[PDB]
Structure 1
C-alpha cells in the first residue's frame, strides 16, 4: 500500500502538522484513511481525520460505513501496517502502537481481508 497523502505532502511538512495536532488536541489522534487501490468500494471524501482516543474501530467502521454509504451486508476491513486491528480497540491504542515518524496513523480500508 502506498498512501497518496505521503506523495501529496512532503515529509517534513507532515511531521510538522502531526506534532501540532497532537499538541493542541492531546485527547485526539491524527489519522490518514485511504483505500486499498485494488479494493472495490467507494472512495472517501477526505483523507485526514481527528479521532478521539477512546473511539473504537467498530464505531470508526460504521462512521466509515455511512460516510461511504455501505450496507451492513458489505465487508469493510482496516489495515494498519498490513494487520487488521481488533474491532473492539481504541484509536488511541492503535496510534501509540503504529503512528509513523510524521506522527500520523495510516489506515488502509478494503472490502477484502487481504488486499493486493
Structure 2
C-alpha cells in the first residue's frame, strides 16, 4: 500500500469481500483501485461484471455495516468505511430483505 500511494496518491485501493454465507456469482479479484473522484454508480459497474451477474440479478453492497445511496464517491468513502492500514473494506450479497 505504501508504494500504491506513492504512484497512486489520489487513488482508493478498496478491499472486496462477501456477506455471511453469500451466494453471488464468481469473482476475479477482491481489490479494486478506483480514483477518489469515482462515484458509487461507477464502482457498481466495475464489480457488477466481476460478480458474474447481469440482466436483472440482485445485489447489495455493504461497507463498514452501512448502505448509502449512489450519491457518494469512492474517495470520500475511504475516510468513512476504511478498515485498518490505508486499504478500505467493501462487501456484497445477493439480497438484503427478510429471508436468506
TM-score normalised by length of structure 1: 0.73
Distance 2:2 2:98 in 1: 30
More helix per residue: 1
> Following superposition, which runs of at least 4 residues in structure 1 exceed 6 angstroms of deviation?
none
Asked if structure 2 preserves the Cα contact closer than 8 Å seen for 1:77 and 1:113, the reply is: yes
**Residues 99 and 80 (structure 1), Cα distance of their counterparts in 2 relative to 1, 3 Å cut:** same
SS in 1 for 2:75: helix
Q: Which runs of 5+ in 1 are unaligned?
A: 1-17
Shift of 1:51: 0.8
Structure 1, 67-76 or 77-86: larger mean CA deviation: 67-76
Distance 1:47 1:90 in 2: 19
Match of 2:7 among 24, 32, 37: 24
Shift of 1:36: 1.5
**Residues 115 and 103 (structure 1), Cα distance of their counterparts in 2 relative to 1, 3 Å cut:** farther
Q: How many pairs were matched up?
A: 99
SS in 2 for 1:60: helix
Asked if structure 2 preserves the Cα contact closer than 8 Å seen for 1:78 and 1:110, the reply is: yes
Distance 1:69 1:101 in 2: 28
Q: Which runs of 5+ in 2 are unaligned?
A: none
SS in 2 for 1:31: strand
Shift of 1:72: 3.7
Please give the per-residue CA displacement for 1:25-82, whole angstroms capped at 9, x wherever unaligned: 1120111111114222113111122111111221211221122231242121111111
